[PDB]
Design an enzyme around this catalytic site. Structure first.
Site, PDB file in Angstrom:
ATOM      1  N   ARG A   1       0.291  -1.218   0.005  1.00 34.41           N
ATOM      2  CA  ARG A   1       0.215  -0.136  -0.045  1.00 34.41           C
ATOM      3  C   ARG A   1       0.852   1.803  -0.355  1.00 34.41           C
ATOM      4  O   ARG A   1       0.577   2.148  -0.547  1.00 34.41           O
ATOM      5  CB  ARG A   1      -0.994   0.348   1.308  1.00 34.41           C
ATOM      6  CG  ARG A   1      -2.701  -0.217   0.361  1.00 34.41           C
ATOM      7  CD  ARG A   1      -2.143  -1.823   1.174  1.00 34.41           C
ATOM      8  NE  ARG A   1      -4.168  -2.777   0.678  1.00 34.41           N
ATOM      9  CZ  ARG A   1      -4.572  -1.943   2.106  1.00 34.41           C
ATOM     10  NH1 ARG A   1      -4.700  -1.382   3.170  1.00 34.41           N
ATOM     11  NH2 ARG A   1      -6.159  -3.120   1.327  1.00 34.41           N
TER      12      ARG A   1
HETATM   13  N1  ADP Z   1      -3.295   5.684  -8.614  1.00 32.97           N
HETATM   14  C1  ADP Z   1      -2.494   4.797  -8.382  1.00 32.97           C
HETATM   15  N2  ADP Z   1      -1.065   3.897  -9.073  1.00 32.97           N
HETATM   16  C2  ADP Z   1      -1.448   2.986  -8.062  1.00 32.97           C
HETATM   17  N3  ADP Z   1      -1.742   2.861  -7.015  1.00 32.97           N
HETATM   18  C3  ADP Z   1      -2.690   2.555  -6.960  1.00 32.97           C
HETATM   19  C4  ADP Z   1      -3.867   4.043  -7.335  1.00 32.97           C
HETATM   20  N4  ADP Z   1      -4.935   3.553  -6.826  1.00 32.97           N
HETATM   21  C5  ADP Z   1      -4.780   3.046  -6.355  1.00 32.97           C
HETATM   22  N5  ADP Z   1      -3.473   1.661  -6.170  1.00 32.97           N
HETATM   23  C6  ADP Z   1      -3.601   1.443  -5.690  1.00 32.97           C
HETATM   24  O1  ADP Z   1      -4.510   0.719  -5.089  1.00 32.97           O
HETATM   25  C7  ADP Z   1      -4.163  -0.971  -4.252  1.00 32.97           C
HETATM   26  C8  ADP Z   1      -5.543  -0.604  -2.824  1.00 32.97           C
HETATM   27  O2  ADP Z   1      -4.934   0.401  -2.496  1.00 32.97           O
HETATM   28  P1  ADP Z   1      -6.222   0.826  -0.556  1.00 32.97           P
HETATM   29  O3  ADP Z   1      -7.332   1.523  -1.366  1.00 32.97           O
HETATM   30  O4  ADP Z   1      -6.033   0.500  -0.014  1.00 32.97           O
HETATM   31  O5  ADP Z   1      -7.284  -0.669  -1.146  1.00 32.97           O
HETATM   32  P2  ADP Z   1      -8.515  -0.703  -0.074  1.00 32.97           P
HETATM   33  O6  ADP Z   1      -8.720  -0.028   0.003  1.00 32.97           O
HETATM   34  O7  ADP Z   1      -9.153  -1.698  -1.326  1.00 32.97           O
HETATM   35  O8  ADP Z   1      -8.181  -2.144   0.758  1.00 32.97           O
HETATM   36  C9  ADP Z   1      -3.004  -0.390  -3.804  1.00 32.97           C
HETATM   37  O9  ADP Z   1      -1.815  -1.232  -3.462  1.00 32.97           O
HETATM   38  C10 ADP Z   1      -2.776   0.843  -4.750  1.00 32.97           C
HETATM   39  O10 ADP Z   1      -0.787   0.906  -4.459  1.00 32.97           O
HETATM   40 MG    MG Z   2      -9.138  -0.718   3.457  1.00 35.59          MG
END
Ligand code: ADP
Ligand code: MG
Ligand code: ATP
Ligand code: ATP
Ligand code: MG
Ligand code: MG
Lengths: 81, 460, 503, 187, 477
Positions: free
Chosen positions: C367
């Site tokens: 993340r």
């Molecule tokens: N603009 C972006 N560029 C690269 N990776 C992104 C981008 N937006 C989101 N991600 C990726 O989305 C993934 C999910 O992150 P997160 O929002 O914490 O997931 P969730 O909330 O579904 O558990 C991460 O690995 C993050 O790096």
């Molecule tokens: Mg989350």
């Protein structure tokens, strides 16, 4: 795992559908390569049906085991009170 | 008030025995003799003047016989405009190191849901700018949204996109309830809200109130922090007339926290070990989120789906409490397409031609249909290959891949609704079947798609 | 019915000793002593039995105390005297612990003499809140190409190493620990990373082999090893991660940077489940207690990066999780996956396919991402990442793709090249400059000519050459953190020369 | 602390409390004294007013123990029995004290060496042969022993006697002989 | 007086252990002190387990509980039509009190075997897929089972709205009084549903019983039986009723919670032992009475929400084994354009063919046979089956809140099955369909009139239909 077996079963089911359809069209066009295609797709469909039978056995076994495990969880949780 | 004594301390469950003045269920009790405030929420009456309680912070150092005072009311948090820009925990204490929250009104976090005659039917679509969401399952003002997804599909970043766009484009005193999420992400969100001007530490014109009970809290705190956020938003709706936003991230932890309490509360477990009282307790929570004739509370809820199941009791129970659910799928997230919204699993109640119009509705249904037929044809291409199939079928597969690419949205993009339906029509009709498939990946409207196509063709 | 309603208590009570600071054992069995008395004892307070054994008052009940015993219960009989000490658990912390192997309570078990630290710290302390932290910015270098490139870890992150048995999780943690030698040998103090390895429920021979591997790599003089092995009482295996976390929180709170590896948390959850079932607490899913998420969450939330107004230190966690038959839908894998900031998922199929470290990049995630990468690794890793994503998305149809478009064939070829590029041997962690050199030689197109089976030979030969003849370029890429345009041209020159002269 | 266990061992909360009381009395030799005491206590409680006063689950423990301590200071009861009733009020096991009383009785019933004999007949028993059977049953015992003979009648057993000495059991009835002869002629 | 009056001894998450009440009957309604009512579900030797029709914050240990003397009952009658009540019959629409003159128990026994007669007359849903392939009769229990957001409530509401043409006509024995029980729904969803029904003038003959998600678990458990008794009133008084339970899964969940907190032994998925009983004795009260008992009927349309289409779950298993068929709704067919998303290969109606009208029987026999062979094959003969099947499945689609009369359905299916749409290619049929309807509505009221009056397609009407359809197909774009 139940969802894995379900996914793999659906995979092999659509494969069997496709191969039996190809056997149909090959037997249609055959009316020396169309013959080989028809017999090969017949073999593929029956082999897919065998794998579907085995995976269905394993699926039923697994879902019975899942019901048992969750019931034993509920029972042992109720008996601790 | 009423004074009792602690008799048993088991994990996060505390039994208190009152001589006189037994406190009703859901009351809050304060433990005396502690540096930090430790609140216990009543859960059960066990007879013989003994009540069972769930602790709001860790229970180390508690002694059998320690005096406990009765508040005489449920957990009362400060509500008002003075909570805007601050961070409070489940019990309404500030955790931002800026001093007390000097409000004029206190509100109990346990209140009844609005009645039936207070219900509203008005459904006015809120356009957010994203092609996939606003196209397939667009959001409605006054209704609950919900954002399902496993761990790593993009729920937090999606709710942050929504925070930016909506909460800045809005004038209705948003509220963010962090229900058992990572403290690192909470600090990140706080600081980037500060540097984005949404929170003003000086000359307070702030427009978002933050509530945080993070992961290292006991289960009772993570179960009641969503109620705290609800109480703040309910003030900003009821006694302020505003149209409030309520970003609840993440709601499953709420449900999850419920499970973690029921174990020790002496209750037989239900399916998946969840509590017997899951559905109706989550219901008493989710029914307070609604549009009454006094004001609206449109709620954007990120919902954690364990193991991407979507049949687990918590997500399956939440699904019915929502007006426009958009499920973030892992299989789409591994494709690199972002956001990971599942087009064949995201449903909206305002996607009917009586609200969005026949053109938008037709585009939505056509996109979903062509994606479903694409998945169906993927069977035959996985067996034989696309170079052995029909003419319009592989043309449809190409159009469907183009649509899959154009559903992505990164520099950030803002694609208006009419422009969105225009672009998706131009792809659906086949007006741009000569442009390559990867020209639509990570772009805005059709203009940036054709422009990136021009550039990529000019080099390669 | 009634635990304290025994006939002895009843008869000497109707008939007519300090039962506030002292108790008597009513019942002892399976390491759970019920104690009558101890009316003043606190929850989670540590008490002392007559035999010298210690216990932790876990169940404060209306008429008795359920105490978990820190040892073998053969030395505890009914009627024994239990005294208070008035304190919760605490472990010695400080610089004096580096290079020492201790147990779950901070006692030296390597026979090098007693610990000479000056300060102690509680094990159940709370985590830093919202305000004392700051964003994870600084890279934690693992020396593994797949991790440092595609699953980057930053200082203050909690990255889960999850996988089946015998897939390479301990090896990843040990390579990470060994890698920090290049930073701890220097003089720049803000790149030094002090390591802590918590061994939970392992053999003593495994921990001995691990300490030998760290000593033969000269990586013990900055490492602490907390050892709660398989023969140790379940409370000690329950308590070892918190002792390790306190030993690392000393470094975090004092402006230094620490890394901690829980190897592993499945066995800590097992020990907690045993203690909870023997304390008659109501079982939940897979018999695990209801507050096991609370367990792992309260542990893992203490890994944080502090802002400059709080010292600026950090603590990085690398919990390890063992899944049974690749089933991540279990209870403890689900909990720890939801708690951490990403997972390095290791496959067995990938392990035996020669792909080792067997990191499944399709399922791995971080993340923090490129925010925890240097600029050079970022520049190469973005393109590498998208390339591999496309390759894996189209690789469902490999072994036949030669009968199709040139696009699919080139995707598959570049993907096989890149997957051969990420293989790496054990106990040889690469510096970041060399990783960026290899990934440059791989992604800009300098491997479409070599059939995939020689990519490893090219990798080895190229690194030998660039460490022999191009120390200045590597040094400037180290100083700059990025590939400068001059350094870009020099890298291109070097890789072109080498592929020309390569066989 | 060492405990003196009675010759008979009773179980349940009743048995546990009565065993505690017996092992307390045996260290000071007040067994029949506290027997008199608990007899008076049981007859005090069996009256309806105070019984409903202590059987009420709405009266708070302090109030009911207040009434109990008042009434036990009324009858100048020994500290042992006052402590016992205080423990029954503390642990909330008070409503069951009657059983405890009965329990203790049975306990001391084997302290003086009595054995309960139960003689069932098909006919209401005579006097002469009843005393004869009493004398016969006395011969099965050791010295220092007493017969608690209580002969109730079952007119369905078709004759003979069914004697129960402790749990030893002799079935001299005629219906069982009829059943046995039928089984013999059948198998 | 501890025989008609108890005193709360314990309270926890909805369950009151009450001491006293020595003369209370099993499953009797008692009245707490704060006004909330309860049901005595457990009669134990030392206490009574009472389930509370309200919240626990209002009652605490020591409260008083009085006895009513009667089992749980509900106001029934004509006065409920147009009114939205809760699970006890109390008006929640703010339009005042219910002028009900009759009360009726909620847990009565279903009618026996002699009082019944075969299900013979049709319950017209106004939906083409249902009325053609899965017909429902008056007296039947037809399940509506499917995943989330698949169109179940839409089927129910289309039925309720379609009944309007019969409720405004003349013949009393063709009218139908509808009841919609909402269990575990959102209060917003129920308010918007009541608005939908009021706009289409469908409230004057509809009762809405609402046990929303914010109501106590006893109220959600009770609402289906309250609605069923309200419908049994019309059934027993010679009228015809229809009742929808939306849905039974949430009633089963509420009952599971209630029984788990009453310490009753859990079974599969923590459901009690009689969770089958719970539903069976509910769905057996939907019956068709012979003319010696009034001739009334009560049609039940229970709704079931499956998870990932699993129909072998516990509660779906029970309700499938109880009802006389089911209408499967699928998401994969929901997105392929098939709307209503009725999976016809799985949807069953055991007593349906005896319910259809003669004209719809005629056209639907051929339609079902053709769809069956097409699904079985799904050259110069087989792609003929494919083409007919595709045109028919394009003829099955239908819009929301617009149910069709039966003769219009027969006209459309007749245009489809005789081969008149073999000319037009798939993406045309829908167009034609709409246009064709306008035609047969505007200039051809006599043909639809005689089909509705005679119930069948006489050869005169058959010739008129075929000449109409060829004249319209000739001059159609
Ligand atoms: N603009 C972006 N560029 C690269 N990776 C992104 C981008 N937006 C989101 N991600 C990726 O989305 C993934 C999910 O992150 P997160 O929002 O914490 O997931 P969730 O909330 O579904 O558990 C991460 O690995 C993050 O790096
Ligand atoms: Mg989350
Ligand atoms: N990158 C690698 N290259 C070659 N071999 C490796 C690599 N990583 C691990 N191995 C080997 O795989 C074997 C198992 O690895 P390791 O024990 O470190 O992982 P583990 O998950 O901790 O296994 P366990 O379940 O026993 O704890 C070891 O023999 C190790 O040498
Ligand atoms: N025949 C139809 N044509 C077009 N849209 C339809 C049709 N039927 C249903 N829909 C739409 O599908 C959406 C969901 O359908 P609906 O709410 O009726 O089913 P549901 O199973 O009751 O959903 P829930 O899970 O919330 O209970 C609605 O917005 C509705 O407008
Ligand atoms: Mg290992
Ligand atoms: Mg519905």
């Amino acid at each position: 795992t139940l969802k894995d077996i379900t996914r793999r079963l659906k995979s092999i089911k659509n494969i069997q559908k496709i191969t039996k359809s190809m056997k149909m069209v090959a037997a249609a066009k055959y009316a020396s390569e169309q013959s080989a295609r028809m017999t090969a797709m017949d073999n593929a469909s029956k082999n897919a049906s065998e794998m579907i039978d085995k995976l269905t056995l394993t699926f039923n076994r697994t879902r019975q085991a899942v019901i048992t495990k969750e019931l034993i969880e509920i029972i042992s949780g109720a008996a601790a009170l | 008030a009423a004074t009792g004594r602690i008799v048993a301390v088991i994990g996060a469950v505390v039994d208190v025995q009152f001589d006189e003045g037994l406190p009703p269920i859901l009351n809050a009790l304060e433990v005396q003799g502690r540096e930090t405030r430790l609140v216990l929420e009543v859960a059960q009456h066990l007879g013989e003047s003994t009540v069972r309680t769930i602790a709001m912070d860790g229970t180390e150092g508690l002694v059998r016989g320690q005096k406990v005072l009765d508040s005489g009311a449920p957990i009362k948090i400060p509500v008002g405009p003075e909570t805007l820009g601050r961070i409070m925990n489940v019990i309404g204490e500030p955790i931002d190191e800026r001093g007390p929250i000097k409000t004029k009104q206190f509100a109990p976090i346990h209140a009844e849901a609005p009645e039936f005659m207070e219900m509203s039917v008005e459904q006015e679509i809120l356009v957010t700018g994203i092609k996939v969401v606003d196209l397939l399952a667009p959001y409605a003002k006054g209704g609950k949204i919900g954002l399902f997804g496993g761990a790593g599909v993009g729920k937090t970043v999606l709710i942050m996109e929504l925070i930016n766009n909506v909460a800045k484009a809005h004038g209705g005193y948003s509220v963010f309830a962090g229900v058992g999420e990572r403290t690192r992400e909470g600090n990140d969100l706080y600081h980037e809200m500060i540097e984005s001007g949404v929170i003003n530490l000086k000359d307070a014109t702030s427009k978002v109130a933050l509530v945080y009970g993070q992961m290292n809290e006991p289960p009772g705190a993570r179960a009641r922090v969503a109620l705290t956020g609800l109480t703040v938003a309910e003030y900003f709706r009821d006694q302020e007339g505003q149209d409030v936003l309520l970003f609840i991230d993440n709601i499953f932890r709420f449900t999850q926290a419920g499970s973690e309490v029921s174990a020790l509360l002496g209750r037989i477990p239900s399916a998946v070990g969840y509590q017997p009282t899951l559905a109706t307790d989550m219901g008493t929570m989710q029914e307070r989120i609604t549009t009454t004739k006094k004001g609206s509370i449109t709620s954007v809820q990120a919902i954690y789906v364990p193991a991407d199941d979507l049949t687990d009791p918590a997500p399956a129970t939440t699904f019915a409490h929502l007006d426009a659910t958009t499920v973030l799928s892992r299989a789409i997230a591994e494709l690199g397409i972002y956001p990971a919204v599942d087009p064949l699993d995201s449903t909206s109640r305002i996607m009917d031609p009586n609200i969005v119009g026949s053109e938008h509705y037709d585009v939505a249904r056509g996109v979903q249909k062509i994606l479903q037929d694409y998945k169906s044809l993927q069977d035959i291409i996985a067996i034989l290959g696309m170079d052995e199939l029909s003419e319009e079928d592989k043309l449809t597969v190409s159009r469907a891949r183009k649509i899959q690419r154009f559903l992505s949205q990164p520099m950030g993009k803002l694609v208006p609704l009419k422009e969105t339906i225009k672009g998706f029509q131009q792809i659906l009709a086949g007006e741009y079947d000569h442009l390559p498939e990867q020209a639509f990946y990570m772009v805005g409207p059709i203009e940036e798609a054709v422009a990136k196509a021009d550039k990529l063709a000019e080099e390669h | 019915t009634g635990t304290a309603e025994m006939s002895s208590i009843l008869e000497e009570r109707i008939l007519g000793v300090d039962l506030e600071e002292t108790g008597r054992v009513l019942s002892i069995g399976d390491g759970i002593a019920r104690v009558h008395g101890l009316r003043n004892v606190q929850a989670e307070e540590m008490v002392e039995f007559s035999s010298g054994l210690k216990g932790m008052s876990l169940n404060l009940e209306p008429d008795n105390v359920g105490v978990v015993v820190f040892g073998n219960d053969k030395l505890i009989k009914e009627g024994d005297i239990v005294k208070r000490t008035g304190a919760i658990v605490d472990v010695p912390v400080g610089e004096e612990l580096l290079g020492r192997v201790v147990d779950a309570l901070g006692n030296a078990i390597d026979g090098k003499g007693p610990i000479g630290s000056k300060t102690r710290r509680r094990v159940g302390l709370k985590a830093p809140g919202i305000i004392p932290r700051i964003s994870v910015r600084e890279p934690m270098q693992t020396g593994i190409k797949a991790v440092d490139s595609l699953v980057p870890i930053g200082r203050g992150q909690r990255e889960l190493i999850i996988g089946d048995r015998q897939t390479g999780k301990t090896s990843i943690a040990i390579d990470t620990i060994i890698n920090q030698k290049r930073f701890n040998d220097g003089s720049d103090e803000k790149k030094k990373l002090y390591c802590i390895y918590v061994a939970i429920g392992q053999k003593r021979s495994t921990v001995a082999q691990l300490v030998k591997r760290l000593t033969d790599a000269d990586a013990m003089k900055y490492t602490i090893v907390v050892s709660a092995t398989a023969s140790d009482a379940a409370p000690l295996q329950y308590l070892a991660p918190y002792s390790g976390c306190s030993m690392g929180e000393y470094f975090r709170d004092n402006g230094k940077h620490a890394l901690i590896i829980y190897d592993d948390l499945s066995k800590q959850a097992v020990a907690y489940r045993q203690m909870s079932l023997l304390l008659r607490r109501p079982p939940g899913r897979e018999a695990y207690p209801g507050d096991v998420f609370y367990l792992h969450s309260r542990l893992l939330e203490r890994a944080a990066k502090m802002n400059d107004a709080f010292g600026g230190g950090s603590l990085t966690a690398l919990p390890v999780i063992e899944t049974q038959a690749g089933d991540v839908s279990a209870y403890i894998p689900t909990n720890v996956i939801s708690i951490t900031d990403g997972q390095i998922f290791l496959e067995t199929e990938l392990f035996y396919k020669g792909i080792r470290p067997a990191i499944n990049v399709g399922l791995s995630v971080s993340r923090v991402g490129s925010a925890a990468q240097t600029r050079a690794m970022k520049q190469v890793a973005g393109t590498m990442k998208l390339e591999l994503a496309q390759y894996r998305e189209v690789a469902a149809f490999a072994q036949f793709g030669s009968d199709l478009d040139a696009a699919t064939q080139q995707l598959l070829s570049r993907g096989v090249r890149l997957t051969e590029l990420l293989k790496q041997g054990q106990y040889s962690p690469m510096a970041i400059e060399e990783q960026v050199a290899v990934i440059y030689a791989g992604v800009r197109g300098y491997l479409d000519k070599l059939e995939p089976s020689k990519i490893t030979k090219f990798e080895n030969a190229f690194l030998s050459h660039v460490v022999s003849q191009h120390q200045a370029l590597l040094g400037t890429i180290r100083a700059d953190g990025k590939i400068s345009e001059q350094s870009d041209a020099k890298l291109k020159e070097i890789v072109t020369n080498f592929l020309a002269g390569f066989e | 602390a060492k405990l003196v266990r009675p010759p008979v061992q009773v179980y349940g909360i009743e048995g546990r409390y009565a065993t505690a009381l017996y092992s307390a009395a045996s260290k000071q030799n007040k067994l029949e004294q506290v027997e008199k005491e608990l007899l008076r206590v049981a007859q005090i409680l069996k009256e309806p007013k105070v019984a409903a006063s202590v059987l009420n689950p709405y009266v708070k423990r302090s109030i009911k123990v207040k009434s109990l301590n008042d009434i036990t200071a009324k009858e100048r009861f020994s500290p042992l029995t006052t402590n016992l009733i205080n423990l029954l009020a503390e642990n909330g096991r008070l409503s069951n004290t009657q059983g405890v009383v009965s329990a203790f009785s049975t306990m001391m019933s084997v302290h003086r060496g009595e054995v309960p004999c139960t003689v069932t007949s098909a006919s209401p028993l005579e006097e002469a042969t009843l005393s004869e059977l009493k004398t016969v049953l006395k011969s099965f015992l050791s010295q220092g022993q007493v017969l608690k003979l209580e002969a109730k009648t079952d007119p369905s057993i078709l004759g003979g006697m069914i004697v129960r000495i402790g749990e030893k059991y002799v079935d001299m009835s005629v219906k069982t002989k009829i059943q046995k002869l039928g089984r013999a002629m059948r198998e």
